[PDB]
Design an enzyme around this catalytic site. Structure first.
Site, PDB file in Angstrom:
ATOM      1  N   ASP A  31       0.783  -1.167   0.039  1.00  8.85           N
ATOM      2  CA  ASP A  31       0.571  -0.047  -0.045  1.00  8.85           C
ATOM      3  C   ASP A  31       0.864   1.241  -0.142  1.00  8.85           C
ATOM      4  O   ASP A  31       1.487   1.486   0.782  1.00  8.85           O
ATOM      5  CB  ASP A  31      -1.182   0.039   1.031  1.00  8.85           C
ATOM      6  CG  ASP A  31      -2.269   0.170   0.858  1.00  8.85           C
ATOM      7  OD1 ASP A  31      -2.049   1.988   0.268  1.00  8.85           O
ATOM      8  OD2 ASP A  31      -3.553  -0.106   1.290  1.00  8.85           O
ATOM      9  N   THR A  67      -7.231   3.409  -2.147  1.00 10.14           N
ATOM     10  CA  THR A  67      -7.534   1.753  -2.102  1.00 10.14           C
ATOM     11  C   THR A  67      -8.333   0.666  -2.996  1.00 10.14           C
ATOM     12  O   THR A  67      -8.166  -0.456  -3.420  1.00 10.14           O
ATOM     13  CB  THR A  67      -6.755   1.691  -0.072  1.00 10.14           C
ATOM     14  OG1 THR A  67      -5.877   2.126   0.300  1.00 10.14           O
ATOM     15  CG2 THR A  67      -7.011   0.340   0.035  1.00 10.14           C
ATOM     16  N   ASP A  87     -23.061   4.322 -30.364  1.00 10.68           N
ATOM     17  CA  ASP A  87     -24.362   4.878 -29.717  1.00 10.68           C
ATOM     18  C   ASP A  87     -25.195   4.687 -31.034  1.00 10.68           C
ATOM     19  O   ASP A  87     -24.495   4.627 -32.214  1.00 10.68           O
ATOM     20  CB  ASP A  87     -24.386   6.455 -29.709  1.00 10.68           C
ATOM     21  CG  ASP A  87     -24.276   6.735 -28.229  1.00 10.68           C
ATOM     22  OD1 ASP A  87     -23.671   6.252 -27.406  1.00 10.68           O
ATOM     23  OD2 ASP A  87     -25.193   7.727 -28.240  1.00 10.68           O
TER      24      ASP A  87
HETATM   25  B1  SWH Z   1      -6.268   3.165   0.949  1.00 10.85           B
HETATM   26  O1  SWH Z   1      -6.717   5.220   0.767  1.00 10.85           O
HETATM   27  O2  SWH Z   1      -4.552   4.028   1.584  1.00 10.85           O
HETATM   28  C1  SWH Z   1      -6.454   2.780   1.983  1.00 10.85           C
HETATM   29  C2  SWH Z   1      -7.761   2.611   2.814  1.00 10.85           C
HETATM   30  C3  SWH Z   1      -7.981   2.043   3.660  1.00 10.85           C
HETATM   31  C4  SWH Z   1      -7.592   1.255   4.165  1.00 10.85           C
HETATM   32  C5  SWH Z   1      -8.188   0.310   5.321  1.00 10.85           C
HETATM   33  O3  SWH Z   1      -7.321  -0.932   5.466  1.00 10.85           O
HETATM   34  C6  SWH Z   1      -7.937  -2.247   4.662  1.00 10.85           C
HETATM   35  C7  SWH Z   1      -7.028  -3.520   4.991  1.00 10.85           C
HETATM   36  C8  SWH Z   1      -7.319  -4.544   3.959  1.00 10.85           C
HETATM   37  C9  SWH Z   1      -7.254  -4.361   2.734  1.00 10.85           C
HETATM   38  C10 SWH Z   1      -7.372  -5.649   2.211  1.00 10.85           C
HETATM   39  C11 SWH Z   1      -8.025  -5.076   1.135  1.00 10.85           C
HETATM   40  S1  SWH Z   1      -9.387  -5.256   0.153  1.00 10.85           S
HETATM   41  C12 SWH Z   1      -9.447  -5.909  -0.894  1.00 10.85           C
HETATM   42  O4  SWH Z   1     -10.378  -6.046  -2.269  1.00 10.85           O
HETATM   43  N1  SWH Z   1      -8.937  -7.084  -0.719  1.00 10.85           N
HETATM   44  C13 SWH Z   1      -8.798  -8.669  -1.680  1.00 10.85           C
HETATM   45  C14 SWH Z   1      -7.235  -8.507  -2.803  1.00 10.85           C
HETATM   46  C15 SWH Z   1      -7.772  -7.889  -4.045  1.00 10.85           C
HETATM   47  C16 SWH Z   1      -6.780  -7.580  -5.168  1.00 10.85           C
HETATM   48  C17 SWH Z   1      -5.564  -7.535  -4.558  1.00 10.85           C
HETATM   49  F1  SWH Z   1      -4.414  -8.530  -5.067  1.00 10.85           F
HETATM   50  C18 SWH Z   1      -5.271  -8.626  -2.884  1.00 10.85           C
HETATM   51  C19 SWH Z   1      -5.964  -8.939  -2.230  1.00 10.85           C
HETATM   52  C20 SWH Z   1      -7.806  -7.343  -0.224  1.00 10.85           C
HETATM   53  O5  SWH Z   1      -7.641  -8.406   0.760  1.00 10.85           O
HETATM   54  C21 SWH Z   1      -8.184  -2.910   2.498  1.00 10.85           C
HETATM   55  C22 SWH Z   1      -7.959  -2.297   3.340  1.00 10.85           C
HETATM   56  C23 SWH Z   1      -5.803   0.738   3.908  1.00 10.85           C
HETATM   57  C24 SWH Z   1      -5.602   2.231   3.010  1.00 10.85           C
HETATM   58 CA    CA Z   2     -23.322   4.494 -25.985  1.00 10.92          CA
HETATM   59 ZN    ZN Z   3      -3.790   1.847  -0.420  1.00 14.74          ZN
HETATM   60 ZN    ZN Z   4      -3.440   6.146   2.762  1.00 11.50          ZN
END
Ligand code: SWH
Ligand code: CA
Ligand code: ZN
Ligand code: ZN
Ligand SMILES: *[C@@H]1O[C@H](CO)[C@@H](O[C@@H]2O[C@H](CO)[C@@H](O[C@@H]3O[C@H](CO)[C@@H](O)[C@H](O)[C@@H]3O)[C@H](O)[C@H]2NC(C)=O)[C@H](O)[C@H]1NC(C)=O
Length: 758
Positions: A116, A154, A647
C-alpha cells in the site's frame, strides 16, 4: 468445537459450528481455543545459535528442532544459522530457463506481494536500503512505473487488479459510496461492506475455483501479523498434491501509514521501507530453505503513490456555494455532491470565481474520456477535480492520495520474478487493468470478459500461451462513380500508410478519393466515419480566400437524398459547420476546391470552431516539423448514454433543427510518425510513435478560464487534458486501425494502449 488439526483451513465451516480460518476474526465466529492453537508468539520469529539443536516444544511460534524440515514449521533463518548456509540475497544472479519444481507439481505456483502506497520513485534509493527488492528488480522483469485507476484510492485499485475492469463496471467506485436502489451506504468502518451485493464482476479466486484450480484466501484479518502470514503460505506449500493450492496473496498496510504522517520526502521514511525488505527477505530465504526458490513465480506490485498535502492548503465550499447546509459532499482529493434543489445553479456558482482557484467543477458526462468514470448509479452527477498537493472541504498529516491517474506522484511499482518472466530485461510502463489477463495466463486459465487488451503484455514473459488475432470485417465498402441544395460557391497508399480501417458493425458506407485526402462516407449518418491525410516537414500553410469563405459545393458521387444541406445550418440559430480536412494545408489552389465539398462538411458550434481552427491552421504543421512528417486520421463520436461504447441510431438524442443530420458528442484525431526521427514518416524502417485526443463538442468554453485571451495561451493545454489511447477511440467508433503493417501484431497492441502524458 475445537481448532485442533484445523488451523487456517481452506474450507469454510458452519453455521453454527465455530470456524478456524483466517477470516473468522472479522465475522467474530472463531472457537475459544483458536487464539492459543493457531496464533503463537513464544520465542519470536528468529532462530539463534544458542537455540540450534533443541527438543520440540508445542508452545513456540516457529520450531528450531531437526524434525522441523519433515514437518514444514522451521524458522526463516534455520538453514542460515544452524546448518551454516548463505542468505538468498547474498548469492549471485543465475538464469532460470525451466521451472525446477518437484515431481507431482501440475503448474508453477503464483504469489502476489501487494504493498500500500509504494511510490514509483522510492526504488531510486540505494541498494543498501532495500537489498532484497533491488535483486528482484535487476534480475527479473521490471517497469519504471505503473499507472493506477481513478480514484487513486485503496478499495477501487486493489479490486481492479483482481477483476481487470474499470470501477464503473466492477461496482466499487470508492472507499465511501451510496446506492439509491438499496438505500444503504458503503463505508470503510462498518458491517455493510461485508455484503456480497456491492461486489461485482468475476475476481481471480472465483475464476480458478470454477476451472478446477485451488485458490487460497486473499483477505487477511488485521490482528494476524506479517510474519505469521509468510509462515502460513510456506506451510500451505508443504501440503500434499491433492490439498495444496496453486495461487496465494500477501498484503501490507505500509509504507502508506508512515507516508501519510511524515510525507514522501521525509527522513523518517527510510526505516518503514527497511522493514518491507526484511519481510521480502524472509519469504525468499523460506523458498530457498524449501528448495522452491527456482519453481515459484513472484509479483511485487502497488496500488497508488504519495503527494505532499497539508492543513494550510484547503478550499472551502462555504466561500462559493449558496446554502451548503442543504447538501452532502465526499471530501478530500476528490469531490462528489448530492442532495439531503437545482444542479444547474451549483456548477454556475463554482465556475472560475477565484483567480488562483485549485478545483474544477464537472458533470460526470463532461469528464475526460480517459478517466472512464460515469456509467454507474453510484456515481454522483456533480463532480470536482482537485489540483495536486490540495484538499477540498464543505466548511471548517503531511501526505495524501486520490488525484488524477496521470499525476507523476501517484504512479506505482511492478516487478516480475520467476521461470516464466524474462531474464534481466526492462519493459516500458503499462496500466493496472492489464494484469488480470497475465495472471490468468500464468495459471493456465480462460479469463472472464474484462477491460484489458489480451496480448498487449506478451513482451513480459519468455513463454507465451495466448496468440492474438485480428477481428473480421463485417461491412464491405462501395466505390461510386458519377450520377441546389441551398449551397453556393464562386498514389493513394501515400495518404493511408498503415492500411484502411475495418468496419465492425452493420451499415452502408463508401470510399472517396481526393488529391489531398481519403475518407469513409456513411450514408446512414450523412457524414464520414474517418478521414486520412499525410503532411511532410517541407509543406507550407496557405491562406483561406475571401470568395471561398461560405463556399460549399455538391459531390457528384453521392445521391442528393444521402447528403447534408446548407439550408439546415441557415435555419439553426445555434449550429454552424466545419471541415475534417483543413483547406489551409492544400497542395495547389485547384486542389483547395476538394476541401469545400459537402461530403467533407461536419456540424460544429461557433464556440468549438475557435479550438478546431487553431489546431488545423497552427498546431498540425508544428508537429510535422518536430516529428519529421505526420499521418492524421480524424472524425466524429456519438455517446449520449455515457457507456463509452458506440451509440445506435435509436440512441441519438440531438439533430440539426428541422433535419435528420445527427450532432456528435466528441471529435477524435490520431497522429502517427516514425519512432526514429531521423527518418521521414513515409520512409519508416522499424517501430512507430503515436499521440491521440478525444475533444468534447461543447457550445461554450467554460472549462478554459483563460478563453478570453488569445488561442496561443489556452488551446494546447486543453488538448493535453483530453489525451487518449487508440483503443478508447475504437470502442466509441467501432473501427479497427493499423491493419497493413510490416510490424508484429503484439507491437500493434502495445501501441494501441499507449497514453501520451506530457
Ligand atoms: B488507502 O486509501 O490507503 C486505504 C484505505 C483503507 C484502508 C483500510 O484497511 C484495509 C485493510 C485491508 C484491505 C484488504 C483488501 S481490499 C481487497 O479488495 N482485498 C482483496 C485483494 C484484492 C487484490 C489483491 F491483489 C489482493 C487482495 C483485500 O485483501 C483493505 C483496506 C487501507 C488503506
Ligand atoms: Ca453509447
Ligand atoms: Zn491504498
Ligand atoms: Zn492511504
Ligand atoms: C468493459 O468490460 C465490461 C465487461 O466485459 C463491459 O460491459 C458489458 O457490456 C454490456 C453492455 O454494456 C452489458 O450488457 C449486455 O447487454 C445485452 C443487450 O443486448 C443483453 O443481452 C445482456 O444484458 C448483456 O449482459 C454487460 O452486462 C456488461 N458487463 C459488465 C460486467 O459491465 C463494458 O462495456 C466495457 N467498457 C469499455 C469497453 O469501455
Amino acid at each position: 468445537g475445537s481448532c485442533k488439526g484445523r488451523c487456517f483451513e481452506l474450507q469454510e465451516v458452519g453455521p453454527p459450528d465455530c470456524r478456524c480460518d483466517n477470516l473468522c476474526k472479522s465475522y467474530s465466529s472463531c472457537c475459544h481455543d483458536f487464539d492459543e492453537l493457531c496464533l503463537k508468539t513464544a520465542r519470536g520469529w528468529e532462530c539463534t545459535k544458542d537455540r540450534c539443536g533443541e527438543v520440540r516444544n508445542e508452545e513456540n511460534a516457529c520450531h528450531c528442532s531437526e524434525d522441523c524440515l519433515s514437518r514444514g514449521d522451521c524458522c526463516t533463518n534455520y538453514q542460515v544459522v544452524c546448518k551454516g548456509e548463505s542468505h538468498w540475497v547474498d548469492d549471485d544472479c543465475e538464469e532460470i530457463k525451466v521451472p525446477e519444481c518437484p515431481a507431482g507439481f501440475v503448474r508453477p505456483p503464483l504469489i502476489i506481494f501487494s504493498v500500500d502506497g509504494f511510490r514509483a520513485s522510492y526504488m531510486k534509493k540505494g541498494s543498501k536500503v532495500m537489498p532484497n527488492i533491488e535483486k528482484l528488480r535487476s534480475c527479473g522483469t521490471h517497469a519504471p512505473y505503473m499507472r493506477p485507476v481513478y480514484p487513486t484510492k485503496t478499495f477501487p485499485n486493489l479490486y481492479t487488479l483482481a477483476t481487470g475492469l474499470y470501477p464503473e463496471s466492477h461496482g466499487i467506485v470508492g472507499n465511501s459510496m451510496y446506492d439509491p436502489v438499496f438505500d444503504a451506504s458503503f463505508h470503510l468502518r462498518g458491517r455493510e461492506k461485508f455484503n456480497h451485493r456491492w461486489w461485482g464482476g468475476q475476481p481471480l479466486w472465483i475464476t480458478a475455483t470454477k476451472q478446477g484450480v485451488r485458490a487460497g484466501t486473499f483477505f487477511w484479518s488485521v490482528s494476524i501479523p506479517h510474519e505469521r502470514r509468510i509462515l502460513t503460505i510456506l506451510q500451505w506449500l508443504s501440503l500434499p498434491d491433492n490439498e495444496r493450492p496453486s495461487v496465494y496473496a500477501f498484503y501490507s498496510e505500509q509504507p502508506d501509514f508512515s507516508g501519510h504522517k511524515y510525507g514522501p520526502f521525509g527522513p523518517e521514511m527510510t526505516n518503514p521501507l527497511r522493514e518491507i525488505d526484511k519481510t521480502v527477505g524472509q519469504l525468499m530465504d523460506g523458498l530457498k530453505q524449501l528448495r522452491l526458490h527456482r519453481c515459484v513465480n513472484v509479483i511485487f506490485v502497488g496500488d497508488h503513490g504519495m503527494e505532499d498535502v497539508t492543513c494550510d492548503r484547503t478550499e472551502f465550499l462555504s466561500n462559493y456555494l449558496t446554502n451548503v447546509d442543504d447538501i452532502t459532499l465526499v471530501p478530500g482529493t476528490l469531490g462528489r455532491i448530492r442532495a439531503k434543489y437545482d444542479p444547474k445553479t451549483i456548477i454556475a456558482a463554482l465556475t472560475c470565481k477565484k483567480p488562483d482557484q485549485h478545483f474544477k467543477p464537472y458533470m460526470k458526462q463532461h469528464l475526460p474520456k480517459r478517466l472512464h468514470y460515469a456509467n454507474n448509479r453510484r456515481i454522483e452527477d456533480i463532480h470536482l477535480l482537485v489540483d495536486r498537493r490540495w484538499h477540498v472541504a464543505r466548511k471548517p498529516f503531511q501526505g495524501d492520495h486520490g488525484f488524477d491517474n496521470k499525476v507523476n506522484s501517484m504512479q506505482t511499482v511492478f516487478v516480475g520474478y520467476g521461470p516464466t518472466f524474462k531474464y534481466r530485461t526492462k519493459v516500458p510502463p503499462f496500466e493496472n487493468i492489464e494484469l488480470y489477463n497475465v495472471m490468468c495466463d500464468l495459471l493456465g486459465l480462460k479469463p472472464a470478459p474484462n477491460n484489458g487488451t489480451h496480448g498487449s503484455l506478451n513482451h513480459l514473459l519468455r513463454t507465451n500461451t495466448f496468440r492474438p488475432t485480428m477481428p473480421d470485417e463485417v461491412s464491405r465498402p462501395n466505390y461510386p462513380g458519377i450520377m441546389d441544395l441551398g449551397c453556393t460557391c464562386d498514389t493513394e497508399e501515400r495518404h493511408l500508410l498503415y492500411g484502411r480501417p475495418a468496419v465492425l458493425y452493420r451499415t452502408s458506407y463508401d470510399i472517396l478519393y481526393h488529391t489531398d485526402f481519403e475518407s469513409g462516407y456513411s450514408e446512414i449518418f450523412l457524414m464520414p466515419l474517418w478521414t486520412s491525410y499525410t503532411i511532410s516537414k517541407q509543406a507550407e500553410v496557405s491562406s483561406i480566400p475571401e470568395h471561398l469563405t461560405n463556399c460549399v459545393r455538391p459531390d457528384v458521387r453521392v445521391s442528393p437524398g444521402f447528403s447534408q444541406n446548407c439550408l439546415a445550418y441557415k435555419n439553426d440559430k445555434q449550429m454552424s459547420y466545419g471541415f475534417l480536412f483543413p483547406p489551409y494545408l492544400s497542395s495547389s489552389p485547384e486542389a483547395k476546391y476538394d476541401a469545400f465539398l459537402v461530403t467533407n462538411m461536419v456540424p460544429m458550434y461557433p464556440a468549438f470552431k475557435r479550438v478546431w481552427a487553431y489546431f488545423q491552421r497552427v498546431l498540425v504543421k508544428k508537429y510535422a516539423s518536430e516529428r519529421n512528417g505526420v499521418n492524421v486520421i480524424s472524425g466524429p463520436i456519438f455517446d449520449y448514454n455515457y457507456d463509452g461504447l458506440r451509440d445506435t441510431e435509436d440512441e441519438i438524442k440531438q439533430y440539426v433543427e428541422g433535419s435528420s443530420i445527427p450532432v456528435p458528442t466528441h471529435y477524435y484525431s490520431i497522429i502517427t510518425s516514425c519512432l526514429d526521427f531521423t527518418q521521414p514518416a513515409d520512409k519508416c524502417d522499424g517501430p512507430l510513435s503515436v499521440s491521440s485526443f478525444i475533444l468534447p463538442h461543447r457550445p461554450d468554453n467554460d472549462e478554459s478560464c483563460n478563453s478570453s485571451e488569445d488561442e496561443s495561451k489556452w488551446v494546447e493545454e486543453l488538448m493535453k487534458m483530453h489525451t487518449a489511447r487508440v483503443r478508447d477511440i475504437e470502442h466509441l467508433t467501432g473501427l479497427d486501425f493499423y491493419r497493413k503493417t510490416s510490424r508484429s501484431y503484439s507491437e500493434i497492441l502495445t501501441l494501441k494502449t499507449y497514453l501520451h502524458t506530457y
